[PDB]
Nucleic acid binder design. Structure first.
Ligand SMILES: [Mg+2]
Ligand SMILES: [Mg+2]
Ligand SMILES: [Mg+2]
Ligand SMILES: [Zn+2]
Lengths: 196, 52, 161, 190, 134
RNA sequence: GGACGGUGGCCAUGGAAGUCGGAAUCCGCUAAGGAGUGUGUAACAACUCACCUGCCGAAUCAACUAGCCCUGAAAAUGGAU
């Protein structure tokens, strides 16, 4: 089972690199399974994105560089959480398409927020059923019209720090778009040339 | 009425622990065997009961 | 002071959110210590005071008297600070030199009460005797002969009924 | 089984130098001097470089129990280096439900007076180990800072405070009051 | 904001239910429909399907219209009053058809797989209608 | 770091959405994702596992077994290799 899967992965990567002479090395950041599925369905007819074990990728391409040279140039660059994007079209189309299909990731418990989000002094819009959470986070409010209205601005969280568990749910209930991050291309490999 | 951060800091020392079933010794949460001779370093451990 | 402010703020917010009878049916219904609609004290020890009483005794130390008492009362609570070195109020949280000044409420109300409490519980007979003439309080019989926690009760009773 | 040789090397920065007197290690850095003797462990201590200052710990013909001491000695020496370069700072938050815990720092941060732990009239006087200074942080509300050079002494002083503030005859799952070591770090954060 | 945000979906059905159904629980989400809104919702969603009726409601600021996506279990239980492959072949020409798929045979694979609730032998050796849908 | 769609999979219902339960036990995307290991919720949600991936670069893990030692192992006058 395991050895069969590894051999099948070797076969898949070698046939894909043979089919597409030009490919990108792409950084798989903290993108969810749904985000990988949506980029897969976005390039369902454009190109192919292939991930897996870097230790396997290095070994297979080093063992089967013989049928096509200039494959060794990708070796010192496939490090960390990286994968391949074998393509037939140009660079710009795939580049700006995978930069275009961004997905906003909501902050959760034990999360890092590179972006700053600030609560406004605007009506929440729902019933007064989050007063306990508002008082826990410290935002003292007023009650009117069967809803909740924020009476002041509060610096909710800073940039690149730790977000609290009783603060992530407050951001979720207020429905503010937090820091977002998608899929970024490490570099581009065109038949023997490497570019940004 | 303690804020949750300080509450969990106190609970790290007071509640998040293992108890030996033979000698009731208070062991660290990742314990597998009791550290005391009088039970024979038994691995009969349970979590410390919560107030829930 | 922070605990007192939290209590009065909580009472004000609950009376606002359930008392939709704002200005109108009953007029203003909020409570402010400046307005004199909150009191401070302890019932077990039989003593209580108001910003009105403290303002009045400071004015006495210092129809028109009512206005003066109201002015001192307004300046005696809130984010007003007092410089003990200069004996003057200030809106600034710190002195112009850079020394932080205690606020008027604490400095001019709690500090004497805290001083007498500390003196009585630490058994400073000479200071407890001289604060009597400092406060100019009348002192009847049966209390000069005993000291301690009942002495604290008696002196607070006869100072702030 | 007797392993022929078990060795481990630690690296010494430039700003700190280490002298050996048999098995007594003297670690001299910017923040002072530390000194600790390992005569209870039969090891060979060597200094190697005149450029990078490697200290190597060797154990010959050891068994399972005394191969465990090589890494222990290396960790102690690394902690000494860390103490004389960056120092050890333990931050202790004091938690309470009802009664605030009043902590008064006596002479030069050597005595700690806990006054109102759970509202009892007894006063706790904790004596810090020599070379350890205690203070009340100016940043947070209820926080003690214990600064020193020896991790042994600093952590032992923190444990003295923590065990001094101990609830008795009560459900300690409910009564969480006390002073607890919040975090352990360095000074100057280099 | 188009005067209403009622795009949240709904998964009650079968009998009217009313109190037993989560309609009074979801009523405050809009606060416009209330009992009349979530009763006309059941009026429009009694059938198609006769099941839990996974739908999406749209508010005309007094009235409510329910668009019912074709859930696979819903449509198979509704089409039931055996192979029956010819009906499930066309049962997904109107679905979302995203399914994190690559070709059309994935959908019929998923249908034959989910209809086990045996229709599993036909899962492996299937060659008819591979590209029939597109 | 990820841990996805049908699917809040069928029937139990007053809610049991992967986790009170009676049965079944799939596929697509896949590097990986159990129509579910536990925590948890009224149910959700949120944690967490089992599965993969990155850093790390060399051996490691499990179940048994039998030697010595320890626990099991409590008595009365002070005491017996
Ligand atoms: Mg270590
Ligand atoms: Mg008791
Ligand atoms: Mg024995
Ligand atoms: Zn034990």
């Amino acid at each position: 089972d395991r050895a069969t899967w590894k051999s099948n992965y070797f076969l898949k990567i070698i046939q894909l690199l043979d089919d597409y002479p030009k490919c990108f090395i792409v950084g798989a950041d903290n993108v969810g399974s749904k985000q990988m599925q949506q980029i897969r369905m976005s390039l369902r007819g454009k190109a192919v994105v292939l991930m897996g074990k870097n230790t396997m990728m290095r070994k297979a391409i080093r063992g089967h560089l013989e049928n096509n040279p200039a494959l060794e140039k990708l070796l010192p660059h496939i490090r960390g959480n990286v994968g391949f994007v074998f393509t037939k079209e140009d660079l710009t189309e795939i580049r700006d398409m995978l930069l275009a299909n961004k997905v906003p990731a909501a902050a959760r418990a034990g999360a890092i927020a590179p972006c700053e989000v600030t609560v406004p002094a605007q009506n929440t819009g729902l019933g007064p059923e989050k007063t306990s959470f508002f008082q826990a986070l410290g935002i003292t409010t007023k009650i009117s019209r069967g809803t909740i209205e924020i009476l002041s601005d509060v610096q909710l969280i800073k940039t690149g720090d730790k977000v609290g568990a009783s603060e992530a749910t407050l951001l979720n209930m207020l429905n503010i778009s937090p820091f977002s991050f998608g899929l970024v291309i490490q570099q581009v490999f065109d038949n023997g040339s490497i570019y940004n | 009425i303690i804020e949750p951060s300080l509450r969990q800091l106190a609970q790290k020392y007071n509640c998040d622990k293992m108890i030996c079933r033979k000698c009731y010794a208070r062991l660290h949460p990742r314990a597998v065997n009791c550290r005391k001779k009088k039970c024979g370093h038994t691995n009969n451990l349970r979590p410390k009961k919560k107030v829930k | 002071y922070q605990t007192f402010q939290r209590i009065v703020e909580n009472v004000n917010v609950i009376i606002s959110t359930y008392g939709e009878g704002e200005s109108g049916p009953m007029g203003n219904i909020m409570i402010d210590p400046v307005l004199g609609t909150v009191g401070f004290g302890s019932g077990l020890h039989g003593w209580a005071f108001t910003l009105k009483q403290f303002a009045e005794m400071y004015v006495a130390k210092f129809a028109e008297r009512a206005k003066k008492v109201e002015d001192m009362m307004k300046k005696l609570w809130g984010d007003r600070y007092f410089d003990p070195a200069n004996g003057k109020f200030s809106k600034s949280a710190t002195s112009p030199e850079g020394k932080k000044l205690p606020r008027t409420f604490c400095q001019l109300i709690l500090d004497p009460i805290f001083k007498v409490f500390d003196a009585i519980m630490n058994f400073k007979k000479e200071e407890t005797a001289k604060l009597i003439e400092k406060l100019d309080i009348k002192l009847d019989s049966e209390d000069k002969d005993k000291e301690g926690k009942p002495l604290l009760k008696a002196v607070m009773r006869r100072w702030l009924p | 089984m007797k392993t022929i040789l078990s060795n481990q090397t630690v690296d010494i920065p430039e700003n700190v130098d280490i002298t050996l007197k048999g098995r007594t290690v003297i670690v001299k850095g910017p923040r002072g001097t530390l000194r600790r003797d390992f005569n209870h462990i039969n090891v060979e201590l060597s200094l190697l470089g005149k450029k990078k200052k490697r200290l190597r710990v060797d154990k010959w013909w050891g068994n399972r129990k005394e191969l465990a001491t090589v890494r222990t000695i290396c960790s102690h020496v690394q902690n000494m280096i860390k103490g004389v370069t960056l120092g050890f700072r333990y931050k202790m938050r004091s938690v309470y439900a009802h009664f605030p815990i009043n902590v008064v720092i006596q002479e030069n941060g050597s005595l700690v007076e806990i006054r109102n732990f759970l509202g009892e009239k007894y006063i706790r006087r904790v004596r810090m180990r020599p070379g350890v200074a205690c203070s009340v942080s100016q940043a947070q509300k209820d926080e003690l800072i214990l600064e020193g050079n020896d991790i042994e002494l600093v952590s032992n002083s923190a444990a003295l405070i923590q065990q001094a503030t101990t609830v008795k005859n009560k459900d300690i799952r409910k009564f969480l009051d006390g002073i607890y070591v919040s975090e352990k770090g360095t000074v100057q954060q280099a | 904001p188009n005067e209403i945000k009622v795009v949240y979906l709904r998964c009650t059905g079968g009998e009217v239910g009313a109190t037993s159904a989560l309609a009074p629980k979801i009523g405050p989400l809009g606060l416009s429909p209330k009992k009349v809104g979530d009763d006309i919702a059941k009026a429009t969603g009694d059938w198609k399907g006769l099941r839990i009726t996974v739908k999406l409601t749209i508010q005309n600021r007094q009235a409510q219209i329910e668009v019912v996506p074709s859930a696979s279990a819903l449509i198979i239980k509704a089409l039931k009053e055996i192979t029956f492959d010819e009906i499930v072949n066309i049962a997904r020409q109107m679905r979302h058809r995203s399914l994190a798929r690559e070709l059309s045979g994935t959908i019929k694979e998923i249908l034959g797989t989910a209809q086990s609730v045996h229709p599993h032998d036909i899962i492996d050796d299937i060659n008819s209608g591979a590209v029939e849908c597109p």
